[PDB]
Amino acid sequence: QPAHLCFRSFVEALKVDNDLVEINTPIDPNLEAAAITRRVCETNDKAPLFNNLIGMKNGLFRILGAPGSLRKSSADRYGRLARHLALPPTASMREILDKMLSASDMPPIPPTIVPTGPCKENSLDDSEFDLTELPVPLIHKSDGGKYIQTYGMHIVQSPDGTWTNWSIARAMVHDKNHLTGLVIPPQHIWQIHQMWKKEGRSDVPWALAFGVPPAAIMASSMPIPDGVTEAGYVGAMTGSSLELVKCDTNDLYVPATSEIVLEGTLSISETGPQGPFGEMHGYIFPGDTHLGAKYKVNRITYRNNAIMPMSSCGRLTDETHTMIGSLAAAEIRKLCQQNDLPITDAFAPFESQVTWVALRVDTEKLRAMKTTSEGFRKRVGDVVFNHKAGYTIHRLVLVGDDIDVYEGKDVLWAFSTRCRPGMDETLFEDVRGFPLIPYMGHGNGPAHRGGKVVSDALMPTEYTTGRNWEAADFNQSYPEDLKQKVLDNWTKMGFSHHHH
Amino acid sequence: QPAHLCFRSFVEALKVDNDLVEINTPIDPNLEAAAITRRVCETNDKAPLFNNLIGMKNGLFRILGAPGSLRKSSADRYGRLARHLALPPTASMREILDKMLSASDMPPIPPTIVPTGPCKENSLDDSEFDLTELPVPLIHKSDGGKYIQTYGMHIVQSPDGTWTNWSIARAMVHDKNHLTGLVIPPQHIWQIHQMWKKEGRSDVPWALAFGVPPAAIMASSMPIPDGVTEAGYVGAMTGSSLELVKCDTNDLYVPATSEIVLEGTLSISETGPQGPFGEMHGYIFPGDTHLGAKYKVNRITYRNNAIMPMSSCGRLTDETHTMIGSLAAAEIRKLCQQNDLPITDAFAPFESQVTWVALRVDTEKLRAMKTTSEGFRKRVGDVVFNHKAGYTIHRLVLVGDDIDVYEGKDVLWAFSTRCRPGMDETLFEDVRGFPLIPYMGHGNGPAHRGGKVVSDALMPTEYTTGRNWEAADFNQSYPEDLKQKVLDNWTKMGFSHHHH
């Protein structure tokens, strides 16, 4: 099976790439696996595969940390992401995001049902598992629970059967047969949960699949539109129908090669303690526990030698930056274009803790609009901040054609030198806010509303007659023949490899 | 003579440090020397010493580029700055800035007059030099003149003789015996020029000394208080009286070991075309020429084998970032402390193109003030933005004790995650603005007023009961004994030098 369609194959790809470290001596799921993974993430090291977890029982489970984190060299920086998508490991962020968007103007390819798969190799009923006895990791020292679910896919379906959503949302172990987790608006898991609540008749049929096809976990982390089944979008993207198997205890369908599958229900009435958790913006607020969604687990099925992927999230750089940030930026790029806005490119700079998106503008198109900063700012912000795709993003930075939005340094340069504080910004207080950002949930204002801004780093002539500067840098402040002479004589004069 | 007290000795120190490249083949002052220097600055390479300039006449002149720029390794990143100050090359920014501030609570050590020095080895009168025939550099391709003066010290004295100011301000060649330059408020050269204008009787006696004692060029680039003679402050800092010699044609005094000295007058009536120039924020606006201050040159004196230092300024990182930014931050730190504000540290992040200063707050002191964000923001901004030391700075970022303001990454993290846009900021529109910033001089608003902001990245509990988070990073989210075990086993498990 190819790496983009089978997690087990993806792990073997990372080995072959020399992008994996296999750790075959015992590692404690209480903190040590997550501490090793956190260090990997902070240093862009190789992904850790923990083949010997203390307390692993009945084949449950190995752990792979840092599945979507960055590689050290600039040449294949995004190579672990590329390997989720059948892209070359030297793929640029633009090429990854274009791949993730490519299904947005293709017909879906619905999934194929098969009678069995590797995910049915082993099973445990209600009387045979206990979630408190599995080697579930404690990820950060002050976490309020052991977060089993950091990189699996929740699968829920609308009551009418017309929409099946796949998404990542965190969950922790509550007791031997329940989890608690985040289920919050505007997320699709919440939108579907509301539908079942309003019908009022039963709990939501649910499954959580860990170690799913890498191309599926990428779509699971992207805000594709309301009502769009991720399976059919992944199908279209990959050009193949995904193979799914039916769960044993309900009628949902899971990827045939899933490593571990939990089957049960998401309650429409019950809650339980959840959190705190060390989160994407780089913080944990110890003691910050709240009531959350509660799940009941009725069955576990799993591959022989099952592997649990884990995100040890926090400060830069992990899956919550590379996937949440980038994939929201991609969806924002598309949204803007569908709303007739001249945006060519979007990215969430890591330096902003993925709370900003930089939008590159086609300023030729902009000039033809014959508009102003204030008008344009308002228009862009009204499109993005009233849409789900803008939920996690608090600052949009508009930049002209000379800025590469995939380079944080150049976004910071443009922000710092082209956007006059106050005058060149519009604040948005009556839009949904992202409460996880410390300045929202733990700040001075309402946790769920406002706090957003559009910062215009377009210069005045970019709206009228065209750019009227040159950069004071080596590239633009010297003629081409001089530049080349200097570069040709550089090491000869005594001054100091692309891959590395 | 020691390196901090003699430019020629400083160049020999850089050689010995293996922080110099001597280029003994011919280099064109039309662009090529500045292009090599710009590349050095963009890559943190060794400083270039051009010993063979095309068109060098009568011993005038060699060029040293990148005199105050950064070194490649993290260990001696600021080593070229340290060498201006008799500090070890591994000195931290905190230690450099503390050295620059140390004279602020010492009595001045006034300079010593000596009868001669190396700067009198050679002389040229009015009938013997022509500034248009010297190998003056064209620094950027669209510059409006050849900027002879990028790293020399202007010397002017109040009419009453009580204040002698030393400062850096740019100047370019106008004709055979005149320069034009920037002389703008609130700068001391402008403050003194105003005094002579109001007296109305004569042009301002002036000298411009190039290749001055490195400790003097550092003070020349710092906004020490109004009325304070830089020579006496440098004296106090270094613990020694500086040796000065009298100019031949006026009664000002120059450093005895200056490489090149121009003597003449700064006009109280005449102006001439100046600019454009590729500037500190990374731009040039071609064709943007304005009338500026005009200087007449009556005499040149110079050392045998004279060396002209040159800053090829623009995008990161050069003297306009390392010296303007850092030294303004230092003065701001002191100003805040003198105004009873609990600021421990200040730095202008390079990532902000030195348009921001991050102020580290002693939050124990802050709690004892029993204040609020809005009050505190206003107080800090009213102190800094109505003072000359705040002139170049458009955004102040307040951060708590856990942030190292000398690390841009940590300042960006705190800004992005702790300061809610709008709500946590106060805008300042009735303060002097820095017009060089593109969003000021070429922006949507008044070039000389407003555009400033105080951004509070203190969290709410930092004002009341204390920090209530831990970072979700390796350092803070794992116990000490685990951290050490992981680090001890890192290379054994298979994962990947301070100097490099």
Ligand SMILES: Cc1cc2c3c(c1C)C(C)(C)C[C@@H](C(=O)Cc1ccccc1)N3c1c([nH]c(=O)[nH]c1=O)N2C[C@H](O)[C@H](O)[C@H](O)COP(=O)(O)O
């Ligand atoms: C890649 C990743 C993604 C998330 C999460 C984590 C990781 C690794 C973890 C589990 C490590 C962290 C956690 C977070 O704490 C971060 C977070 C992000 C957004 C909302 C809430 C929390 N999380 C998560 C998430 N969405 C959430 O609704 N609660 C979540 O718990 N997300 C984001 C979510 O998948 C995207 O918003 C998708 O668009 C949602 O799918 P649709 O609703 O559009 O179908």
Ligand SMILES: Cc1cc2c3c(c1C)C(C)(C)C[C@@H](C(=O)Cc1ccccc1)N3c1c([nH]c(=O)[nH]c1=O)N2C[C@H](O)[C@H](O)[C@H](O)COP(=O)(O)O
């Ligand atoms: C290290 C350096 C510094 C400056 C300048 C450059 C370099 C290398 C050059 C020449 C390369 C660039 C140029 C600038 O274009 C940048 C600039 C900065 C601040 C004001 C105007 C321009 N410049 C300069 C500068 N001050 C200016 O009044 N016109 C100037 O021309 N400065 C700043 C100035 O020295 C400081 O503000 C001092 O505090 C002034 O001394 P006091 O007035 O307090 O005694």
Ligand SMILES: [K+]
């Ligand atoms: K999704």
Ligand SMILES: [K+]
């Ligand atoms: K702007």
Ligand SMILES: [K+]
């Ligand atoms: K000065």
Ligand SMILES: [K+]
């Ligand atoms: K704040």
Ligand SMILES: [Mn+2]
């Ligand atoms: Mn969805």
Ligand SMILES: [Mn+2]
């Ligand atoms: Mn001064």
